[PDB]
mmCIF file of C-alpha atoms in Angstrom:
data_model
loop_
_atom_site.group_PDB
_atom_site.id
_atom_site.type_symbol
_atom_site.label_atom_id
_atom_site.label_comp_id
_atom_site.label_asym_id
_atom_site.label_seq_id
_atom_site.Cartn_x
_atom_site.Cartn_y
_atom_site.Cartn_z
ATOM 1 C CA UNK A 1 20.443 -58.669 103.099
ATOM 2 C CA UNK A 2 21.293 -58.615 99.382
ATOM 3 C CA UNK A 3 19.158 -61.558 98.243
ATOM 4 C CA UNK A 4 16.212 -60.405 100.365
ATOM 5 C CA UNK A 5 16.639 -56.627 100.104
ATOM 6 C CA UNK A 6 16.700 -57.047 96.311
ATOM 7 C CA UNK A 7 13.203 -58.564 96.459
ATOM 8 C CA UNK A 8 11.546 -55.165 96.931
ATOM 9 C CA UNK A 9 10.415 -52.962 94.032
ATOM 10 C CA UNK A 10 13.300 -50.723 93.010
ATOM 11 C CA UNK A 11 11.630 -47.578 94.355
ATOM 12 C CA UNK A 12 11.237 -49.202 97.797
ATOM 13 C CA UNK A 13 14.798 -50.543 98.158
ATOM 14 C CA UNK A 14 17.127 -49.423 100.945
ATOM 15 C CA UNK A 15 20.843 -49.447 100.166
ATOM 16 C CA UNK A 16 23.309 -50.492 102.899
ATOM 17 C CA UNK A 17 26.892 -51.754 103.167
ATOM 18 C CA UNK A 18 25.496 -55.270 102.581
ATOM 19 C CA UNK A 19 23.497 -54.046 99.573
ATOM 20 C CA UNK A 20 25.096 -50.873 98.270
ATOM 21 C CA UNK A 21 23.918 -48.103 95.940
ATOM 22 C CA UNK A 22 25.323 -49.867 92.864
ATOM 23 C CA UNK A 23 23.700 -53.198 93.715
ATOM 24 C CA UNK A 24 20.327 -51.609 94.525
ATOM 25 C CA UNK A 25 20.131 -48.815 91.941
ATOM 26 C CA UNK A 26 22.820 -49.403 89.317
ATOM 27 C CA UNK A 27 26.119 -47.687 88.630
ATOM 28 C CA UNK A 28 26.069 -43.912 88.647
ATOM 29 C CA UNK A 29 26.065 -42.281 85.265
ATOM 30 C CA UNK A 30 24.915 -39.460 83.008
ATOM 31 C CA UNK A 31 22.133 -41.269 81.113
ATOM 32 C CA UNK A 32 18.591 -39.949 81.265
ATOM 33 C CA UNK A 33 17.379 -42.562 83.766
ATOM 34 C CA UNK A 34 20.628 -43.470 85.541
ATOM 35 C CA UNK A 35 21.152 -42.143 89.046
ATOM 36 C CA UNK A 36 23.962 -39.598 89.325
ATOM 37 C CA UNK A 37 24.114 -39.126 93.120
ATOM 38 C CA UNK A 38 26.849 -40.413 95.413
ATOM 39 C CA UNK A 39 30.625 -40.300 95.925
ATOM 40 C CA UNK A 40 32.594 -43.478 96.644
ATOM 41 C CA UNK A 41 31.817 -43.367 100.364
ATOM 42 C CA UNK A 42 28.047 -43.081 99.930
ATOM 43 C CA UNK A 43 27.959 -45.583 97.071
ATOM 44 C CA UNK A 44 29.564 -48.345 99.144
ATOM 45 C CA UNK A 45 27.510 -47.586 102.276
ATOM 46 C CA UNK A 46 24.053 -46.323 101.284
ATOM 47 C CA UNK A 47 22.047 -45.663 104.431
ATOM 48 C CA UNK A 48 25.055 -46.680 106.542
ATOM 49 C CA UNK A 49 26.763 -43.488 105.274
ATOM 50 C CA UNK A 50 27.757 -41.280 108.203
ATOM 51 C CA UNK A 51 25.661 -38.334 107.006
ATOM 52 C CA UNK A 52 22.731 -40.214 105.479
ATOM 53 C CA UNK A 53 20.195 -38.482 107.799
ATOM 54 C CA UNK A 54 21.468 -35.070 106.658
ATOM 55 C CA UNK A 55 20.824 -36.214 103.082
ATOM 56 C CA UNK A 56 17.491 -37.920 103.749
ATOM 57 C CA UNK A 57 16.078 -34.706 105.199
ATOM 58 C CA UNK A 58 15.704 -33.641 101.555
ATOM 59 C CA UNK A 59 13.924 -36.815 100.380
ATOM 60 C CA UNK A 60 10.134 -36.409 100.023
ATOM 61 C CA UNK A 61 7.458 -38.163 101.959
ATOM 62 C CA UNK A 62 5.052 -40.225 99.873
ATOM 63 C CA UNK A 63 2.396 -37.512 100.147
ATOM 64 C CA UNK A 64 4.917 -34.809 99.171
ATOM 65 C CA UNK A 65 6.354 -36.889 96.319
ATOM 66 C CA UNK A 66 2.885 -37.043 94.772
ATOM 67 C CA UNK A 67 1.894 -33.541 95.901
ATOM 68 C CA UNK A 68 5.026 -31.663 94.786
ATOM 69 C CA UNK A 69 6.132 -33.488 91.646
ATOM 70 C CA UNK A 70 5.227 -33.323 87.986
ATOM 71 C CA UNK A 71 4.050 -36.914 87.423
ATOM 72 C CA UNK A 72 3.794 -38.491 83.993
ATOM 73 C CA UNK A 73 3.113 -41.889 82.509
ATOM 74 C CA UNK A 74 4.889 -43.237 79.460
ATOM 75 C CA UNK A 75 3.879 -46.356 77.562
ATOM 76 C CA UNK A 76 6.835 -47.762 75.589
ATOM 77 C CA UNK A 77 8.249 -51.047 74.240
ATOM 78 C CA UNK A 78 9.773 -51.705 77.665
ATOM 79 C CA UNK A 79 6.525 -51.231 79.586
ATOM 80 C CA UNK A 80 4.553 -48.622 81.504
ATOM 81 C CA UNK A 81 6.631 -46.057 83.392
ATOM 82 C CA UNK A 82 5.768 -43.462 86.010
ATOM 83 C CA UNK A 83 7.893 -40.391 85.369
ATOM 84 C CA UNK A 84 8.603 -37.705 87.925
ATOM 85 C CA UNK A 85 10.332 -34.344 88.048
ATOM 86 C CA UNK A 86 10.468 -31.645 90.674
ATOM 87 C CA UNK A 87 12.532 -29.386 92.872
ATOM 88 C CA UNK A 88 12.926 -29.062 96.635
ATOM 89 C CA UNK A 89 13.898 -25.659 97.987
ATOM 90 C CA UNK A 90 16.822 -25.454 100.381
ATOM 91 C CA UNK A 91 16.128 -23.189 103.350
ATOM 92 C CA UNK A 92 18.823 -20.510 103.105
ATOM 93 C CA UNK A 93 17.822 -19.390 106.619
ATOM 94 C CA UNK A 94 18.549 -22.825 108.076
ATOM 95 C CA UNK A 95 21.696 -22.471 110.226
ATOM 96 C CA UNK A 96 22.991 -25.581 108.432
ATOM 97 C CA UNK A 97 22.245 -24.282 104.927
ATOM 98 C CA UNK A 98 25.923 -23.940 104.030
ATOM 99 C CA UNK A 99 26.674 -27.476 105.245
ATOM 100 C CA UNK A 100 23.702 -28.823 103.282
ATOM 101 C CA UNK A 101 24.998 -27.225 100.083
ATOM 102 C CA UNK A 102 28.450 -28.691 100.777
ATOM 103 C CA UNK A 103 26.963 -32.117 101.475
ATOM 104 C CA UNK A 104 24.905 -32.134 98.283
ATOM 105 C CA UNK A 105 27.832 -30.853 96.190
ATOM 106 C CA UNK A 106 29.926 -33.663 97.685
ATOM 107 C CA UNK A 107 27.748 -36.277 95.975
ATOM 108 C CA UNK A 108 26.033 -34.715 92.903
ATOM 109 C CA UNK A 109 27.809 -36.118 89.814
ATOM 110 C CA UNK A 110 30.706 -37.227 92.017
ATOM 111 C CA UNK A 111 31.129 -40.397 89.910
ATOM 112 C CA UNK A 112 32.712 -38.178 87.228
ATOM 113 C CA UNK A 113 35.826 -38.034 89.407
ATOM 114 C CA UNK A 114 36.474 -41.773 89.859
ATOM 115 C CA UNK A 115 36.240 -44.985 87.770
ATOM 116 C CA UNK B 1 7.771 -27.854 108.405
ATOM 117 C CA UNK B 2 9.789 -28.358 105.208
ATOM 118 C CA UNK B 3 7.473 -28.881 102.251
ATOM 119 C CA UNK B 4 9.075 -32.194 101.287
ATOM 120 C CA UNK B 5 8.260 -33.735 104.693
ATOM 121 C CA UNK B 6 4.612 -32.678 104.849
ATOM 122 C CA UNK B 7 1.731 -35.153 104.796
ATOM 123 C CA UNK B 8 -1.640 -34.102 103.376
ATOM 124 C CA UNK B 9 -4.911 -35.147 105.071
ATOM 125 C CA UNK B 10 -8.570 -34.136 104.989
ATOM 126 C CA UNK B 11 -7.759 -31.491 107.650
ATOM 127 C CA UNK B 12 -4.623 -30.273 105.835
ATOM 128 C CA UNK B 13 -5.177 -31.136 102.208
ATOM 129 C CA UNK B 14 -2.983 -31.294 99.108
ATOM 130 C CA UNK B 15 -3.681 -27.661 98.180
ATOM 131 C CA UNK B 16 -2.896 -26.458 101.710
ATOM 132 C CA UNK B 17 0.322 -28.491 101.912
ATOM 133 C CA UNK B 18 1.624 -28.340 98.346
ATOM 134 C CA UNK B 19 -0.235 -25.578 96.472
ATOM 135 C CA UNK B 20 -2.726 -25.600 93.629
ATOM 136 C CA UNK B 21 -2.269 -28.082 90.804
ATOM 137 C CA UNK B 22 -0.704 -26.583 87.709
ATOM 138 C CA UNK B 23 1.734 -26.931 84.804
ATOM 139 C CA UNK B 24 4.782 -24.985 85.901
ATOM 140 C CA UNK B 25 8.115 -26.395 87.016
ATOM 141 C CA UNK B 26 7.662 -26.177 90.828
ATOM 142 C CA UNK B 27 3.921 -26.910 90.733
ATOM 143 C CA UNK B 28 2.420 -30.345 91.231
ATOM 144 C CA UNK B 29 0.104 -31.725 88.557
ATOM 145 C CA UNK B 30 -1.122 -34.872 90.339
ATOM 146 C CA UNK B 31 -4.503 -35.548 91.937
ATOM 147 C CA UNK B 32 -8.183 -35.272 91.054
ATOM 148 C CA UNK B 33 -10.580 -33.350 93.291
ATOM 149 C CA UNK B 34 -11.093 -36.257 95.711
ATOM 150 C CA UNK B 35 -7.359 -36.867 96.209
ATOM 151 C CA UNK B 36 -6.679 -33.143 96.537
ATOM 152 C CA UNK B 37 -9.314 -32.845 99.253
ATOM 153 C CA UNK B 38 -8.323 -35.993 101.169
ATOM 154 C CA UNK B 39 -4.566 -36.461 100.815
ATOM 155 C CA UNK B 40 -3.411 -39.663 102.512
ATOM 156 C CA UNK B 41 -7.020 -40.273 103.680
ATOM 157 C CA UNK B 42 -7.933 -40.882 100.038
ATOM 158 C CA UNK B 43 -9.426 -44.345 99.672
ATOM 159 C CA UNK B 44 -6.721 -45.518 97.244
ATOM 160 C CA UNK B 45 -3.788 -43.695 98.823
ATOM 161 C CA UNK B 46 -1.846 -46.899 99.715
ATOM 162 C CA UNK B 47 -2.074 -47.975 96.073
ATOM 163 C CA UNK B 48 -0.546 -44.667 94.990
ATOM 164 C CA UNK B 49 2.068 -44.593 97.757
ATOM 165 C CA UNK B 50 3.493 -47.932 96.634
ATOM 166 C CA UNK B 51 5.144 -45.975 93.814
ATOM 167 C CA UNK B 52 6.641 -43.248 96.025
ATOM 168 C CA UNK B 53 10.389 -43.784 96.559
ATOM 169 C CA UNK B 54 12.029 -44.582 99.835
ATOM 170 C CA UNK B 55 14.605 -41.990 100.853
ATOM 171 C CA UNK B 56 17.403 -44.313 99.754
ATOM 172 C CA UNK B 57 15.773 -44.919 96.361
ATOM 173 C CA UNK B 58 14.956 -41.225 95.823
ATOM 174 C CA UNK B 59 18.671 -40.402 96.001
ATOM 175 C CA UNK B 60 19.703 -43.726 94.448
ATOM 176 C CA UNK B 61 17.501 -43.710 91.356
ATOM 177 C CA UNK B 62 17.032 -40.044 90.579
ATOM 178 C CA UNK B 63 19.051 -37.569 88.592
ATOM 179 C CA UNK B 64 19.813 -35.000 91.289
ATOM 180 C CA UNK B 65 20.919 -31.422 90.665
ATOM 181 C CA UNK B 66 21.313 -28.241 92.656
ATOM 182 C CA UNK B 67 20.611 -24.818 91.172
ATOM 183 C CA UNK B 68 20.588 -21.213 92.311
ATOM 184 C CA UNK B 69 17.587 -19.502 90.681
ATOM 185 C CA UNK B 70 15.894 -16.081 91.091
ATOM 186 C CA UNK B 71 13.976 -17.568 94.048
ATOM 187 C CA UNK B 72 16.908 -19.220 95.812
ATOM 188 C CA UNK B 73 18.629 -22.594 96.016
ATOM 189 C CA UNK B 74 16.846 -25.740 94.771
ATOM 190 C CA UNK B 75 17.530 -29.461 94.730
ATOM 191 C CA UNK B 76 16.174 -30.753 91.420
ATOM 192 C CA UNK B 77 15.187 -34.379 90.809
ATOM 193 C CA UNK B 78 13.993 -36.492 87.859
ATOM 194 C CA UNK B 79 13.506 -40.199 87.270
ATOM 195 C CA UNK B 80 11.230 -42.974 86.054
ATOM 196 C CA UNK B 81 9.664 -45.937 87.883
ATOM 197 C CA UNK B 82 8.603 -49.048 85.983
ATOM 198 C CA UNK B 83 5.234 -50.555 86.849
ATOM 199 C CA UNK B 84 5.244 -54.323 87.351
ATOM 200 C CA UNK B 85 3.059 -55.830 84.658
ATOM 201 C CA UNK B 86 3.284 -59.179 86.458
ATOM 202 C CA UNK B 87 1.378 -57.568 89.346
ATOM 203 C CA UNK B 88 -2.288 -58.676 89.160
ATOM 204 C CA UNK B 89 -3.140 -55.101 90.212
ATOM 205 C CA UNK B 90 -1.331 -53.684 87.157
ATOM 206 C CA UNK B 91 -4.394 -52.668 85.129
ATOM 207 C CA UNK B 92 -5.952 -50.918 88.126
ATOM 208 C CA UNK B 93 -2.658 -49.213 88.979
ATOM 209 C CA UNK B 94 -2.541 -47.705 85.495
ATOM 210 C CA UNK B 95 -6.182 -46.596 85.721
ATOM 211 C CA UNK B 96 -5.555 -45.081 89.169
ATOM 212 C CA UNK B 97 -2.420 -43.160 88.176
ATOM 213 C CA UNK B 98 -4.028 -42.043 84.921
ATOM 214 C CA UNK B 99 -7.022 -40.731 86.875
ATOM 215 C CA UNK B 100 -4.899 -38.280 88.861
ATOM 216 C CA UNK B 101 -2.200 -37.224 86.371
ATOM 217 C CA UNK B 102 -3.147 -33.734 85.119
ATOM 218 C CA UNK B 103 -6.673 -34.207 86.508
ATOM 219 C CA UNK B 104 -6.881 -30.469 87.278
ATOM 220 C CA UNK B 105 -7.072 -29.695 83.546
ATOM 221 C CA UNK B 106 -10.622 -31.066 83.476
ATOM 222 C CA UNK B 107 -11.963 -29.840 86.812
ATOM 223 C CA UNK B 108 -15.645 -29.301 85.832
#
C-alpha cells in the first residue's frame, strides 16, 4: 500500500500498518505544523488501531471541516497554504464521555514519552 | 447529530448546521452567501472538499489538544494544507478558496 497510498494528497491519506502515521504524516513533534497525536500503538497502526473508530468519531466531515473551522490562506516562499483552526465539543452527556477523554489523553502529545 | 458529522445542504444549510459566520474562536468564517445557502449542493463543493482531511489525516496532520473551558470540554485542532501548484486547477483553487474565506465581512 505504501507506494500507492503515498500517491494521494497528504490531507487525503489513510494511515495503516502497511503505511503508518509516520510514513503518511511525518514524525510526531511540537513544531507549529507537525502532528502531535498518537502513542506508539496508534503510530504504527493508523486506521488499523483497535480504537480508531472511537477516535474517528471526532474527525469532521468535509462539510463540517469547512463549516466549523477558521480557514485562512497564506502565501509564502514555500507556496500557498490553506490554514485551519477550530474546536469540537465533547458531549459530556454521552455515556462514553469519560472513555473518550481517556482515549484522547492517551494519544495527545504522547510522543513526549518515547523516542 | 454531533456537529462535526453534519452535512449541510440546500434544505439544511451552513447556517442551520454550523451557525452564522463570524470571527470568534468556535465560529466558522468560511463561505460566501451562495455556499452558505447551498452547502454540499454548491456548484463547486467537490473542488472545496478536495482540501478537507480524511479522518486519518485530520488526526495525523493536525496539532490536537483537549481543553476544559467555561462551556465544557473541547478537542482543539490546527494545521496547514499545501496546495499543489503543479495542479492545472491551482489558480482556480486559489480563487475559489479566496472567494469564501471571510466572505461574510462583505455581505452587501
